[PDB]
Chains A and B, each alone.
Chain A
Amino acid sequence: TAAGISLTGGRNRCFSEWQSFMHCTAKTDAKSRAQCLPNFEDYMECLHHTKEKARLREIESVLKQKKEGLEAPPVKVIPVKAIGLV
């Protein structure tokens, strides 16, 4: 079937994490799949980005509380007709 076939026929976005989990389940009998948990956790959060959104709201809640705000090399936004302006 089309297990890991992407839109262009390539491999999908979370193929490497899925194939790593399938390496984990290939060499492993039941009653010892408890070690195969971190590969599955990596796959599910590759799919849905749950821990990533959690971490980003943890750091966004701090970002609004500072009056200084941003003391860093900043990210500049551009309009689409100005990719290579300067």
Chain B
Amino acid sequence: DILNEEAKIVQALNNQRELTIKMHELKREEKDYAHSYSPLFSDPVPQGGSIGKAPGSSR
């Protein structure tokens, strides 16, 4: 009855160790432009400055 209450605590601490190692991996994972910039307007493509615009300036 004491070895099982050992193993419960050790299971509950290896759960926290794996929880930390996961949450440290989750930080260095790269993130989408829709999550790490504005959600609305998910493109990085500008089309900026359109009053005297020349066709052929797009690429």
Interface of B (DSSP majority class): loop
Give the interface residue-count category, chain A.
Answer: 20 to 34
Q: Could you count the A-B residue pairs with CB atoms below 8 Å apart for me: how many are there?
A: 60
Measured between alpha carbons, how far is A84 from B32 in the docked complex, in Å? Answer: 58
- Tell me whether A22 and B51 are in contact (CB under 8 A): no
Type the 1/0 row for B27-58, where 1 means its CB is closer than 8 Å to any CB of A: 00010010000000001111111111110111
- Tell me whether B30 and A11 are in contact (CB under 8 A): no
**Is A29 among interface residues, defined by CB-CB distance under 8 A?**
yes
List the A residue with the shortest CB-CB distance to B52.
Answer: A10
Chain B residues with CB under 8 Å of chain A are: 30, 33, 43-54, 56-59
